[PDB]
């Protein structure tokens, strides 16, 4: 903690490079697409809300899926099995009270069996070689939040929202590290709510400037603008909740003025 803030930040920066999925992996998957991946993650978002899981669990589960799919070629009828095993693994890693396995079996409306989920759980662990302590956008965001002059709960919730949105679209977002997406999401959230900008103190912490974040920020800005029009809407619905200060109802800026 605050004796280790910087040690931890440094270490997460080295680990996010190690745990990065391969950018081009969907090209290499014969039977699945970005679009099918989007469907899975959006379902996982609903599972998350149905079981009241941490946002961290969600971010980990997606990290496991992207890494699993970086090395293992998967049929469309099995994508949701991978996703269930990932989310179960994520919950055991991160939740105080993980849902029991039967609850994971149940949420896949009798598509698969308990024995299948548990064998997939095993295969996932083998494929990831047990490297479950992956850094996520969530873990960086939470650190960046400490640099708000007045802490603003709307900035925080909106940052998480934009962070979550970027989980859905592999196309652009797989090319950016969690620390860079978080940077872009924090600045975009700051700007939208308060008119403020990526704070100088985060430049000294991360070494990132508005200039270095710009590419991701260009993509995230568009994703924000087009959010109500996306085929997948579970995140928008999720962040309508008072628990997240209804930040998905806030209006995006039309320009970033960069």
């Amino acid at each position: 903690v605050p004796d280790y803030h910087e040690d931890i930040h440094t270490y997460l920066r080295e680990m996010e490079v190690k745990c990065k999925p391969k950018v081009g992996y969907m090209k290499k998957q014969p039977d699945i697409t970005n679009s099918m991946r989007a469907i899975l993650v959006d379902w996982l978002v609903e599972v998350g809300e149905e079981y009241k899981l941490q946002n961290e669990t969600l971010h980990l589960a997606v990290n496991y899926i992207d890494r699993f799919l970086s090395s293992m070629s998967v049929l469309r009828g099995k994508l949701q099995l991978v996703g269930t095993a990932a989310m179960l693994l994520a919950s055991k890693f991160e939740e105080i009270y993980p849902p029991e396995v039967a609850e994971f079996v149940y949420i896949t409306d009798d598509t698969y069996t308990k024995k299948q989920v548990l064998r997939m759980e095993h295969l996932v662990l083998k494929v990831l070689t047990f490297d479950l302590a992956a850094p996520t956008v969530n873990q960086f965001l939470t650190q960046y939040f400490l640099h708000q002059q007045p802490a603003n709960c709307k900035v925080e919730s909106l940052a998480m929202f934009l962070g979550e949105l970027s989980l859905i679209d592999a196309d652009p977002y797989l090319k950016y590290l969690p620390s860079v997406i978080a940077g872009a999401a924090f600045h975009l959230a700051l700007y939208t709510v308060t008119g403020q900008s990526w704070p100088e103190s985060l430049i000294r912490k991360t070494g990132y400037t508005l200039e270095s974040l710009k590419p991701c920020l260009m993509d995230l800005h568009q994703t924000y603008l087009k959010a109500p029009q996306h085929a997948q809407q579970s995140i928008r619905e999720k962040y309508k909740n008072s628990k997240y200060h209804g930040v998905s109802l806030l209006n995006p800026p039309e320009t970033l003025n960069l």
Binding site: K92, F93, V101, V117, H122, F130, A133
Partner: peptide
């Protein structure tokens, strides 16, 4: 155990944390 809960969360954490 296959017909229960799978790999215990304690083992999931012990292993992944311990390899770091």
């Amino acid at each position: 155990d296959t017909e229960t809960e799978g790999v215990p969360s304690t083992a999931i954490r012990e292993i992944s944390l311990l390899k770091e």
